[PDB]
Amino acid sequence: SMSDIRKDLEERFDKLVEALKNKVDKMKAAFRMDQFHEERMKDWFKDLRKEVEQMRRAVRNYASEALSKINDLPITNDDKKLASNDVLKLVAEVWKKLEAILADVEAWFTHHHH
Numbered sequence: 001s002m003s004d005i006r007k008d009l010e011e012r013f014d015k016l017v018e019a020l021k022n023k024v025d026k027m028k029a030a031f032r033m034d035q036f037h038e039e040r041m042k043d044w045f046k047d048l049r050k051e052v053e054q055m056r057r058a059v060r061n062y063a064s065e066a067l068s069k070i071n072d073l074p075i076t077n078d079d080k081k082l083a084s085n086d087v088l089k090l091v092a093e094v095w096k097k098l099e100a101i102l103a104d105v106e107a108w109f110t111h112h113h114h
Contacts, residue, residue, distance in 0.1 A: 006066075012062050
């Protein structure tokens with residue numbers, strides 16, 4: 001069924017978001033506003049952008065597989081397109097959440113620093 005496919009996809013998306021958030025939160029709690037820590041944020045931001053890229057890659061892989069499952073269902077082509085539309089909406093929402101996490105910690109450090 002459609003809802004199973006959707007529900008399972010959204011659960012994977014939510015795990016990526018939780019995992020990214022955990023990584024960012026734990027850095028902020030370890031962060032002291034001193035020099036050693038300041039000079040390292042450049043590299044840590046570099047590594048966080050790689051992480052986001054890797055998760056956006058996972059997002060495409062997970063969505064491609066959901067679309068595969070949808071296209072195997074005994075439903076009309078019209079219904080398949082409606083389903084893929086719903087998948088694409090879920091993809092847009094996990095993208096937005098992943099990008100906000102990154103944007104938010106980048107703003108936290110700029111603001112911490114000004």
